[PDB]
């Protein structure tokens, strides 16, 4: 079975909107989303659809850009670093579940480089 996807709202968690979080949605997320290699990362891994019955036996903190997008749209994050951590979790999950040289690992490496390029300088 698939696990529940990560929460995109939580009334127990305090919200915030910052210039950096606005930039992370308008610029970083929405630019990465259009990359030719973004498609594996635009939704939670559907292990039933993709016939990956070991995916969630290995990956215990799943994350994807669709979840990140919803979290940004909901002001779920307190600050930009919290959002950056979710991106880094998404990339590392890919490297953990797969192996060096795999096509999807090449995709995540390219997206991670573009991600780092975009967050190198954030607004103030
Ligand atoms: C080795 N593989 C297949 C590994 C299993 N497939 C996936 C692994 C993963 O961590 O995330 C995914 C996300 C979407 C679709 C397939 C996968 C690949 O290189 C490719 C997976 C999808 C694009 S190329």
Swiss-Prot record:
Location in chain, cross-link Glycyl lysine isopeptide (Lys-Gly) (interchain with G-Cter in SUMO2): 57
Similarity comment: family membership: Belongs to the BET family.
Posttranslational mods: Phosphorylation by CK2 disrupt the intramolecular binding between the bromo domain 2 and the NPS region and promotes binding between the NPS and the BID regions, leading to activate the protein and promote binding to acetylated histones. In absence of phosphorylation, BRD4 does not localize to p53/TP53 target gene promoters, phosphorylation promoting recruitment to p53/TP53 target promoters.
Effect of residue 98 to A: Abolishes binding to acetylated histones
Domain annotation Bromo: ranges: 16-122
Cell location: Nucleus; Chromosome
Site positions (Acetylated histone binding): 98
Domain remarks: The NET domain mediates interaction with a number of chromatin proteins involved in transcription regulation (NSD3, JMJD6, CHD4, GLTSCR1 and ATAD5).
Name of the molecule in the record: Bromodomain-containing protein 4
Assembly and oligomerization: Interacts with p53/TP53; the interaction is direct. Interacts (via CTD region) with CDK9 and CCNT1, acting as an associated component of P-TEFb complex. Interacts with RELA (when acetylated at 'Lys-310'). Interacts (via NET domain) with NSD3, CHD4, BICRA and ATAD5. The interaction with BICRA bridges BRD4 to the GBAF complex. Interacts (via NET domain) with JMJD6 (via JmjC and N-terminal domains); the interaction is stronger in presence of ssRNA and recruits JMJD6 on distal enhancers. Interacts with NSD3. Interacts with NIPBL. (Microbial infection) Interacts with bovine papillomavirus type 1 regulatory protein E2. This interactions may serve for the tethering of viral genomes to host mitotic chromosomes allowing successful partitioning of the viral genome during cell division.
Organism, as annotated: Homo sapiens (Human)
Mutation effect (residue 103 to G): Found in a patient with a neurodevelopmental syndrome; uncertain significance
Record function comment: Chromatin reader protein that recognizes and binds acetylated histones and plays a key role in transmission of epigenetic memory across cell divisions and transcription regulation. Remains associated with acetylated chromatin throughout the entire cell cycle and provides epigenetic memory for postmitotic G1 gene transcription by preserving acetylated chromatin status and maintaining high-order chromatin structure. During interphase, plays a key role in regulating the transcription of signal-inducible genes by associating with the P-TEFb complex and recruiting it to promoters.
Lineage, uppermost ranks: Eukaryota, Metazoa, Chordata, Craniata, Vertebrata
Misc. comment: JQ1, a thieno-triazolo-1,4-diazepine derivative, and I-BET, a benzodiazepine derivative, have been tested on tumors with success. Treatment with GSK1210151A (I-BET151, a I-BET derivative) has strong effets on mixed lineage leukemia and promotes myeloid differentiation and leukemia stem-cell depletion.
Tissue: Ubiquitously expressed.
Illness: Cornelia de Lange syndrome 6: A form of Cornelia de Lange syndrome, a clinically heterogeneous developmental disorder associated with malformations affecting multiple systems. It is characterized by facial dysmorphisms, abnormal hands and feet, growth delay, cognitive retardation, hirsutism, gastroesophageal dysfunction and cardiac, ophthalmologic and genitourinary anomalies. CDLS6 inheritance is autosomal dominant.
Domain of life of the organism encoding this protein: Eukaryota
């Amino acid at each position: 079975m698939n696990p529940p996807p990560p929460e995109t709202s939580n009334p127990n968690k305090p919200k915030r909107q910052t210039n950096q979080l606005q930039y992370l949605l308008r610029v970083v997320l929405k630019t990465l989303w259009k990359h030719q290699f973004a498609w594996p990362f635009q939704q939670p891994v559907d292990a039933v659809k993709l016939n990956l019955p070991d995916y969630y036996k290995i990956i215990k903190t799943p994350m994807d850009m669709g979840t990140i997008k919803k979290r940004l749209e909901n002001n779920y994050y307190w600050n930009a670093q919290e959002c950056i951590q979710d991106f880094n979790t998404m990339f590392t999950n890919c490297y953990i579940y797969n192996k060096p040289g795999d096509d999807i690992v090449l995709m995540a490496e390219a997206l991670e480089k573009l991600f780092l390029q975009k967050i190198n300088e954030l607004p103030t």
